Design a protein around this nucleic acid. Structure first.
Ligand SMILES: Nc1ncnc2c1ncn2[C@@H]1O[C@H](COP(=O)(O)OP(=O)(O)NP(=O)(O)O)[C@@H](O)[C@H]1O
Ligand SMILES: [Mg+2]
Ligand SMILES: [Zn+2]
Lengths: 486, 619
DNA sequence: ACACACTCTCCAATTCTCTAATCACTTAC
DNA sequence: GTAAGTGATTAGAGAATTGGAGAGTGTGT
DNA sequence: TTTTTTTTT
């Protein structure tokens, strides 16, 4: 009600944060949290620091803040230069589009609905392919209200340099003085309590702190977060995530949405665990620490529960009870995990695998693992998220294109990707790229998606037939692929 | 292969475009006889067209260089090239005009490898009929008619594409308006609510439209018909290209539209309203002194004019070429030549106001049957901006300006009269002695100060009227009386009589030899004059380029002659001279120097002006 | 008379449960 | 190791619950 | 409302 505020200035939450930190009460709270004797305040202090960091991301604080006003003035002038040139080009194109007089015309060779009739148009069309069959009139069909996608909105902004510096200092002080004792005191209690919300606060604070350490490269702080590095972290996280997914799938209504919200934060914390262990194994100086990280990575790659988790969640996804943020998080998690499995196969460390029956050991093949994701019930959601290519982040676009590229050119099976609902995405991408010169197209951030669409469409049209164009209308199963191929 | 046809006619679009591309790239035939308003182009200032090239390819260079955005297409050239295409253009203008445009733009882009701010647009012209001869067969065909412009409207915005915004989530969509209709979106594709959008008017796009009223020419009509009026609609770059008082020819499409019985309801009246959608306005006419400040005259004809100016006969040669059917009256003809040339313009350019009058006013007064009305008719037909009024056919309000209530807004609005339409032109007033006194007495402010100030209900403003007054009248007794003086044969107030620069007394000199000569001249009509084309160019060049100033010797001489005038006018039974006559003498001296194409007034010019003024009145 | 609002009815989509057929695993030679 | 039989899983059909569109009718200008 | 015109007293 107070007004609408831009995304690149201080929030009203930030003013309370400024007053809170200027009083210096946070140092007393950190001192209380450090004491092992005062356990009953620890869960609430964890809740307080999570709620302080509610509106931020680790990327905002990881980069050290610096500016020069000369560079800032030059940058802002170039931004408004872009805006002015866009406006002038768009207005001249629109006013050059219009035509003066009218008439009515017949398209000889196209049939109408009524008998012996040709198509009729009532505007001076440039060429017959510009005709649209008046699709602009027709009202779009909607899904029912129980089955529409929904986002979850966090008020997220790029705050001022003052607020970002204060918060960066506070995060470093928490890691130095509180984190190990606080997490150790909390994990015994958070899942026993009646109250729900401290579970979400727990997973949020884990995700934020580990991402901040990895991105800021403050490698000497890795001793201070040693409560979260063990194999037990992966075990306990996996248990809680599994329970949340089952409750969110089986219940109905706001209760199902409430449990799915917990599942989202648990999934994000799992992703940060994987990336932090890879960072330790790549860049730590002590070989003992490298060995400790490597044994955990081998456990994750070996045990079936961690290897089967993405397909298990994807087959249970439903937009009635899970947000779009959950699906984007799941796609990125699958991307990083499959890279880890590919390296552990390529180095020869993964050759034989235990499987339940009794337990027996069988050879493992990475192509046999990748073939599981070529199911229709997985590829639905990748084509679903590729429609938002013009506003996705570059990491998400890379993940989607990489997963499709594997089936296209590593398993070498393009018949499963021949599909009309993907060709619509390619049509949108091609229309977007028409507005750019040949240099600007190669400079664009969407050039990977453009090039992949180029190669797949050329492979399709190399052996075009009409029955193949009919087969493009339906999702094709395994025997359908065999009979179409042979 | 799908192919596009005009509905119900079997005309295919592309096959016309092939032939029109050939016409543009190939036609060069008529260029020996290039017309007056078409023979110059420009990159900067002005340049002349070359004969030997393909003509419209030459005209496209103006669109490249001066960035002109239209081509005037003379339809006689197209008819000479191919009648089979000319017939299609005239029969289907609403269907083929959107594609001949595209051929022109294609040829321009191919020739110059360049883009422009707006598309090059066609204007076909010189296809003629009368307003009464139109039939229902002529609907949507190309026609051309002519007339005088009386009124123009203010601009109307006409939308081409609207802009909708969702009320719930601020999403926004464009929507083209076509066939007179817009299509409204129903479902918001972002937030999935229905019946949800609101039009935002000032985020949408509009075009200019203007209405012009046109009046019939009275010359052609059969017995008993009164002249008609027609509505002409101008779109785009033709807007505000014409004034009231101008005489034009229009080429456009003849259209017909229905009207609603009640504005509340869907029912229509079965009798349709008709109008014209304009495509080209032409104002070029060679039978008059031209209307364009003389910009287009060639160097060779300028040198011919300069050579002609060195004759000692130049006054007689120019004067006797005006009104050739009128016998003698050489002094009156020289007076009319001075009226045509005028003095030096003297304006405040900061306020755009006349500091001093430079126009010349003339009264003719004399016996019946002496061709005064005929001389008025010659001056009326010669000039581009002229008006003719007569006797009790005028009112005081109709001569100057009138107030009337508007048809729909119900406000009081102001509209022009004869002296405002004759701005930078001539008003001819016949039977001047027989006007009502109320109608005649409004002329004082216009004849002296060249402005017109008005104060009526809700309307307080001032207009410019830079007209020249030429008048004709009889004496008190209709035949001139020799038992009375000059100021008893004429009876007008001194306030009115002092405002004329020249008064010509025309009294019948009764003589058998003069009777025989005039009778021979009049009877011969049933059985070194300067060419009109040279006279036009001479007057226009002189007006545009010559501005005389007084020499010091001339100023002293003018003071001496004014003192002589003040003594001569004081005698019994004669018109008195006021300080206004000094201004009259200065104007006539400047006119004589302007005819001679001299930048300075000499004592000889003052002597000739004084002799003309004196001998005009000593009868 | 014409436009706008409200209410009722029907039909289609989804999910659970039961039945039948085909595939894979276990047992016997 | 191979062949035959039995058990389990998957696919289809039927029934019930939930929701939204469309058409009809009534009221107000 | 105020303005402009043509017949009548
Ligand atoms: N000098 C002349 N030259 C040519 N035509 C003449 C001359 N004198 C008389 N006429 C003819 O005589 C007639 C003059 O008519 P008009 O032009 O009305 O003269 P006016 O001065 O206007 N007489 P009025 O209007 O009754 O006072 C016309 O038919 C002329 O052609
Ligand atoms: Mg006359
Ligand atoms: Zn919306």
């Amino acid at each position: 009600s107070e007004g609408r505020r831009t995304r690149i200035e201080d929030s009203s939450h930030d003013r309370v944060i400024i007053a809170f930190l200027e009083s210096g009460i946070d140092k007393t709270l950190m001192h209380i949290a450090n004491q092992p004797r005062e356990k009953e305040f620890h869960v609430t202090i964890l809740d307080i620091f999570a709620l302080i960091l509610k509106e931020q991301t680790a990327e905002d604080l990881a980069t050290k803040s610096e500016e020069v006003s000369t560079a800032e003035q030059k940058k802002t002038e170039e931004e408004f230069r872009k805006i002015i040139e866009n406006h002038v080009v768009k207005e001249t194109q629109k006013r050059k589009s219009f035509s003066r007089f009218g008439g009515s015309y017949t398209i000889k060779g196209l049939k109408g609905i009524s008998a012996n009739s040709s198509q009729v148009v009532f505007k001076p069309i440039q060429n017959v392919e510009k005709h649209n069959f008046l699709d602009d009139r027709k009202a779009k069909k909607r899904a029912p209200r129980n089955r529409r996608p929904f986002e979850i909105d966090t008020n997220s902004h790029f705050a001022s340099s003052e607020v970002r510096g204060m918060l960066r200092d506070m995060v470093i002080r928490i890691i130095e003085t509180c984190f190990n004792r606080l997490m150790k005191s909390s994990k015994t209690t958070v899942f026993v309590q009646v109250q729900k919300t401290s579970q979400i606060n727990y997973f949020f604070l884990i995700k934020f702190v580990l991402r901040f350490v990895r991105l800021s490269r403050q490698d000497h702080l890795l001793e201070r977060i040693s409560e979260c590095i063990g194999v037990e972290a992966f075990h306990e996280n996996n248990v809680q995530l599994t329970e949340y997914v089952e409750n969110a799938t089986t219940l109905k209504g706001v209760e199902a949405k409430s449990h799915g919200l917990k599942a989202q934060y648990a999934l994000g914390a799992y992703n940060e665990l994987v990336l932090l262990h890879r960072y330790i194994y790549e860049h730590a100086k002590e070989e003992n620490e490298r060995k400790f990280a490597k044994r955990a990575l081998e456990h994750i790659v070996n045990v079936e529960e961690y290897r089967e988790l993405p397909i298990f969640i994807i087959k249970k996804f439903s937009s009635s009870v899970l947000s779009n943020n959950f699906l984007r998080e799941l796609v990125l998690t699958t991307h990083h995990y499959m890279k880890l499995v590919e390296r552990f196969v390529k180095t020869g460390a993964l050759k034989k695998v235990t499987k339940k029956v009794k337990v027996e050991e069988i050879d493992f093949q990475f192509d046999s693992y990748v073939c599981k994701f070529s199911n229709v019930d997985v590829l639905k959601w990748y084509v679903f998220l590729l429609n938002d290519f013009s506003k996705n982040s570059t990491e998400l676009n890379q993940a989607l294109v990489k997963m499709l590229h594997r089936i296209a050119f590593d398993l070498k099976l393009p018949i499963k990707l021949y599909q009309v609902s993907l060709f619509q995405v390619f049509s949108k991408v091609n229309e977007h790229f028409t507005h750019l010169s040949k240099d600007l197209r190669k400079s664009s951030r969407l050039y990977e998606l453009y090039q992949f669409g180029f190669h797949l469409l050329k492979k399709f049209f190399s052996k075009f037939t009409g029955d193949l164009a009919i087969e493009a209308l339906f999702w094709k199963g395994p025997r359908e692929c065999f009979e179409i191929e042979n | 292969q799908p192919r596009l046809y005009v509905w119900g006619t079997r005309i295919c679009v592309a096959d016309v475009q092939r032939s029109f591309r050939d016409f543009l790239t190939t036609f060069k035939i008529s260029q020996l006889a290039e017309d007056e308003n078409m023979m110059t182009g420009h990159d900067e200032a002005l340049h002349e067209i070359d004969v030997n090239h393909p003509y419209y390819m030459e005209r496209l260079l103006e669109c490249n260089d001066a960035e002109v955005t239209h081509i005037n297409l003379n339809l006689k050239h197209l008819n000479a090239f191919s009648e089979a295409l000319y017939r299609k253009v005239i029969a289907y203008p609403a269907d083929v005009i959107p594609y001949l445009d595209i051929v022109v733009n294609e040829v321009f882009a191919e020739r110059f490898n360049r883009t422009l701010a707006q598309s090059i647009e066609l204007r076909p012209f010189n296809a003629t009929r009368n307003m009464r001869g139109l039939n229902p067969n002529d609907v949507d065909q190309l026609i051309t008619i002519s007339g005088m412009v009386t009124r123009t409207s203010s601009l109307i915005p006409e939308m081409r594409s609207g802009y909708f915004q969702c009320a719930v989530c601020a999403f926004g969509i464009e929507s083209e308006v076509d066939k007179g209709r817009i299509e409204e979106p129903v479902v918001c594709t972002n937030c999935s609510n229905t019946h949800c959008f609101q039009l935002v008017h000032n985020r949408s796009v509009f075009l200019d439209k203007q209405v012009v009223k046109l009046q019939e020419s009275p010359d052609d009509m059969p017995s008993g018909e009164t002249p008609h009026t027609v509505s002409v609609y101008a779109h785009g770059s033709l807007v505000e290209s014409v004034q009231p008082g101008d005489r034009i020819t229009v080429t456009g499409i003849f259209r017909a539209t229905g009207m609603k019985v009640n504005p509340k309801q869907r029912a229509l009246a079965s009798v349709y309203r008709t109008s014209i959608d304009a495509l080209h306005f032409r104002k070029m006419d060679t039978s008059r002194l031209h209307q364009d400040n003389g910009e287009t005259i060639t160097e060779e004809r300028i040198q011919q004019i300069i050579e002609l100016s060195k004759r000692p006969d130049i006054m007689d040669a120019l004067a006797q070429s005006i009104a050739p059917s009128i016998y003698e009256h050489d002094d009156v003809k020289r007076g009319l030549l001075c009226l045509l040339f005028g003095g030096t313009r003297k304006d405040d350019e900061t306020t755009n106001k006349t500091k001093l009058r430079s126009e010349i006013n003339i009264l003719l007064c004399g016996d019946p049957g002496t061709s005064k009305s005929q001389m008025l008719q010659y001056v009326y037909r010669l000039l581009p901006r002229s008006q003719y009024t007569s006797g009790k056919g005028s009112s005081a309000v109709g001569l100057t300006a009138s107030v009337s209530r508007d048809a729909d807004t119900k406000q009081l609005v102001l509209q022009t009269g004869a002296l405002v339409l004759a701005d930078n032109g001539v008003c001819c007033i016949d039977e001047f002695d027989k006007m009502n006194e109320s109608a005649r007495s409004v002329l004082h402010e216009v004849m002296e100060q060249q402005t017109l100030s008005i104060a009526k209900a809700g309307i307080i403003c001032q207009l410019n009227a830079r007209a020249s007054v030429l008048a004709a009248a009889n004496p008190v007794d209709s035949k001139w009386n020799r038992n009375k003086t000059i100021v008893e044969n004429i009876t007008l107030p001194h306030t009115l009589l002092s405002r004329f620069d020249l008064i010509f007394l025309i009294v019948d000199a009764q003589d058998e030899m003069q009777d025989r000569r005039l009778g021979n001249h009049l009877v011969s009509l049933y059985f070194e004059h300067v060419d009109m084309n040279l006279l036009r160019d001479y007057i226009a060049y002189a007006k545009a380029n010559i501005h005389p100033k007084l020499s010091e010797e001339a100023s002293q001489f003018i003071i001496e002659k004014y003192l002589f005038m003040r003594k001569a006018g004081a005698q019994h039974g004669q018109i008195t001279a006021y300080p206004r006559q000094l201004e009259s003498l200065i104007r006539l001296s400047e006119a004589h120097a302007k005819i001679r194409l001299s930048q300075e007034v000499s004592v000889d010019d003052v002597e000739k002006a004084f002799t003309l003024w004196r001998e005009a009145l000593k009868q």
